[PDB]
Each structure stands twice: as C-alpha cells, then as structure tokens.
Design a binder for this molecule. Sequence first.
Ligand SMILES: [Co+2]
Ligand SMILES: [Co+2]
Ligand SMILES: [Fe+2]
Ligand SMILES: [Fe+2]
Lengths: 314, 314
Amino acid sequence: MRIPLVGKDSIESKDIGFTLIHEHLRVFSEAVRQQWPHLYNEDEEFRNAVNEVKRAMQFGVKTIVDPTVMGLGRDIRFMEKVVKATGINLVAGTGIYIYIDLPFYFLNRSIDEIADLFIHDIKEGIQGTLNKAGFVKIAADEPGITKDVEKVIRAAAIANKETKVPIITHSNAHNNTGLEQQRILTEEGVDPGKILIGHLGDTDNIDYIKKIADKGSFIGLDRYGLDLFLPVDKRNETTLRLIKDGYSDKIMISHDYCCTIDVGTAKPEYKPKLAPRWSITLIFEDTIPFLKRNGVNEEVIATIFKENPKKFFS
Amino acid sequence: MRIPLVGKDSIESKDIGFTLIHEHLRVFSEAVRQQWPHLYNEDEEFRNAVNEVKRAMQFGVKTIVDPTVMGLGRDIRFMEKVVKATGINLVAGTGIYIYIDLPFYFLNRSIDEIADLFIHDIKEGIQGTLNKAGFVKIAADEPGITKDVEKVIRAAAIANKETKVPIITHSNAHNNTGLEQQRILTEEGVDPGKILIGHLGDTDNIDYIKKIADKGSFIGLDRYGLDLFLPVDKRNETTLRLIKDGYSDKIMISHDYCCTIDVGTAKPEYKPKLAPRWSITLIFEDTIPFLKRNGVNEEVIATIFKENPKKFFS
Ligand SMILES: [Co+2]
Ligand SMILES: [Co+2]
Ligand SMILES: [Fe+2]
Ligand SMILES: [Fe+2]
C-alpha cells in the first residue's frame, strides 16, 4: 500500500510497528568481493545476520530499515534469504554511498541519469527483483560536500519529489555536512520531515543537533555501541537532554550495527578497544532502561521507535 | 612455462608473438553493474569483444594483454568465454585501479595485506579459477600520488619481487605521475626493465618520455585512437621521433581500446569527435603503415610488438 518490503507485500505505515531505523544486515566493498571472493564467507555472514535479526525480534523489533546501497554492497537476494529465515519486516533502499568521487561510470552523466537509477529501484525493482526501495540513501563525511557528493544529494531530491520516499543520510557529526545536506535537499523542494540526518549521535554539541531538528528533519542518534565515535554514556546524556528539552518528535535511535562488515577497522581484536558491547540490541539492554529510570515514560519511547518512523514513511 | 594464459597452458615468453600490450575486452564499475545490472548487456559485450579480437587476429596479432583489474571490472570467466571463441592468447593481470582512495575494505590494512591479494592472483588463481595473473596493474592520475595510491604502488613492488611478474601502470602524461611511479618502484627494488609506464603517448613532450626510458623503463604509447588525449598524427610524430633518436627497444604501442566501456564519456554520440577511428586495429590501418613509409624497417616493428613484450615478460 505504501511501504515496500523485501520478500513481502507492501504495508501501510500504521503497520510498521517498533522499528530500528538504521541497521546493516551486511556491508562490503562491491569491487573487492567481486575481485577477491576468497576473502568472504557467505555462510557465516548469513548466520550472523539471521541470529541478530532473531534476537532483535525477541525484543519486540517488528521492522528493520537497512541503508545498505551502492558502495556498501547492497544485495536484495541476500536480504531476501534473511527475511525468509526470520519473518522480519525489512525495508530496502536505493542510493549511492560515496565520500569523494563517483565511480568512473558517472563521468559525463547528468544528475537526472543518477536520479533515474533511484527511481528505477523505487518503481521497477532492485537488482532485477520485484523488491522495491522504500527510501533513498546518500552520504558525506570528512571530505565535505564535493562536486559528486552534491550530484548525489540533488539526485535524491529528484527521486523524492517523484516518488515521495523519505531520505536517509550518512554524515560526519563534526564538520556541518549534515546541516549542508539538509540545506541542499530542502532547497530542492524536499520536505524536511522526509529527511533523516544521520550519525548526529556522534557528537556532544547539542546546539548543532537542535539546529537541524529545528529545521524540521529527524536527527539520527543512530550509532549506539560504536564507542570510537562516542561512548554509550555520553550518547545517553545527549539523548536524555534532547528528550527533556522536548525533541522526541525528531529523535530517531538505532545502532548502525553491521552483522558483518569487511572494513579493516572491524577486526575482532579491535572489538574491545572502541566497540565492546556493540550489537543490534544494546538499545534494549542499556539505552532505553537508562532513559526509563531517568523519568522518560513509555509514551516517549513509542514516539521515537514507532511514531517517528511511521511519520517518516507516510 | 613463463606467461600464464587465460583458458590455456602457459607459454614460453619466446612464443608470445605479435602482441598488443594494453587492450580491454570489457570495462565497467563493479559497484554500478552490481546495483543496476539493467544498464548492461552481456550479449553485446561478448559479441563486440569477439568481433574485435577476431579482426585483430586477422592482422597477425597473437597475444593480447588485458590490464583490466579491480576498479575496471575484471572478470576471467567473461575472459575465458572470449578465449574459447577466438583462440587468442590472453594475458590477465592483477592489481588495483584508483585515482584517489582505496575502497573502505582497506582502511587500517597494511601494504603487505594488499600485496597478498596480488600474490594470490599470481600464485593461486583469479576469482576462484585456476587462471593466473601475469602482471600487476597500478594507476595514478590528476589527483597525483595520493597516500592510498602510493600504498598500491608499494604493494605491486612486493608482488613483483615475490613473483617476478612485470608491472604495467596507468599514469597521467602531464602531471609527472609516471616518473613518480617509476621512482618509488625502483626504490623498492623493482627492476626498471620490468615496468611499463603507460599513457605517455598522450603527450608530445619527448624530453619527459626519454627521461623515463633513460631510467630503464618501457614507455607506453598505448592510446592510439583516443584523440581527446592526443590526436593520432601527433602521436605518430612522437612515436617516429623516439624511434629516430634510438628508443625502439623501450617503446611499446597499443590502443588501450575498450571493446565495451560503461563510462558516459564513451557514449556513441561523443565518439565522432573524441575518438573517430578508435578500435583495436587502428595501428594496422594508420600507425604501422605510417612508420614503414617513413624509414622504419620490419626489424624495428618486430622489436616493438614482439621483442619488447617478450623482454617485458622475462
Ligand atoms: Co553511515
Ligand atoms: Co589506463
Ligand atoms: Fe550505516
Ligand atoms: Fe587501459
């Protein structure tokens, strides 16, 4: 009816339920896996993804939004297996994930051409399947808004205006990229309430986070567990403050957890260093209980994990 | 017994025959093709490659060296089908093709880890097959010698010293990257005579070219047909001058032709002006006939397309 699901019939937003807005079933570099497949283990990746999703469902997680796209190794078929194995509601997306330049393929390609790719995934289907994308993902990091990163941003705007699917972003909390993303998108006619500025939970700077929420976009406190960016307790302080300041209407919380990720930084011997208890359920284990014993009632929790996702997708 | 061939028993370097040292059966962005396969057509690509290679064999070509690696869309299985259909001697390689940064996978990974990937393709095989790489390909362009670009160059060095295979590079003829690639490789202990500094035919600055050759490396006048880099006539004038000054034993000539390329710059609309008569048989139609009628004997032609490739793979 509204929100497309992987390996399932579309559902109305009122059916989305308790959602984790930013989680990855699996992440890898398309090029390396294609060129050195001996580096990967399809079987193990599947076990880890199925196990995480099951544990999350045991906590009452009803729907999981996965922002894995070009550049992160999106694969609907793999996502489709995980769905059959768990019965989870999985929202797949489209888009391009880059930090500096686009693949050489886009050399001399218009912004419209890029947009046509997103729209294709949205209206036609993903990677040859009839599984449709329910949102579009774009990114920017340390390098800032480069010429190509902007191409992609604009392309997203075009897709959104044509399909009305929301936009989720990856940004660097310390260099105003998120703010710039929101600025460019809203200028292109994109409803701020259809944007989720991501990874804002990576900083203490409350003024900056409110600045973006005030503009009318959702704020992503979406890396709980990734201590290397910001410890759990400090994220909790921030999240609590935002809540006490009445910003639940714009808050979205998730882990950005990678059930499997090929990045050299995700090596086991580093897990303890700056990502000890990083998982897809840390939120039920630590964050929510912390907020509850700190005044935050159940209705605020529902707003964040149910209402917000619902508005975002309607 | 010396040079590995795709879908064939390795051959002595002495049996290499007339060789095109730099041609591409197919080129594409892994990430793009993987996320939007609807943009590509197997059949077309296969026919184009088969047709080109056949015409090339009708002109006396025995061996084609295809430097399509990671980033360029390497695919030995596609390469095998072509060999089975043409019977051509095809040399596949390993390496990485970047201008700026490495895929995220390499974040926090040593140069040694990268080298192990090349050594894997050379010793073990490519993409789960027993076809082995005969060389390593590296690149550098406008951005110059970035940190990740340099990490690849040093990785290639390690591979060479371990496996003995030669190194083909891609460079920018105007930014000095070619000479940089040479300095680093030699400093790492790589034999200059086992390096091919490519795309030097894009410039008519003979001084810079002679310098690279004086330092013992092969010079690649390998883009005949690509007028957008440098018209055929100016390339021919350079080639001829170099030969007159006695650089035949360092000169290697090719088209760098892509039987099919996904890049928007290679659109059939921009072909009449960026590369009018650009194919894998252009040198037989223009370059070679030009050199001959200009005082270049069969001996020198044989040195460039037969002796130099032989030496390079020894
Ligand atoms: Co992100
Ligand atoms: Co090249
Ligand atoms: Fe993410
Ligand atoms: Fe090339």
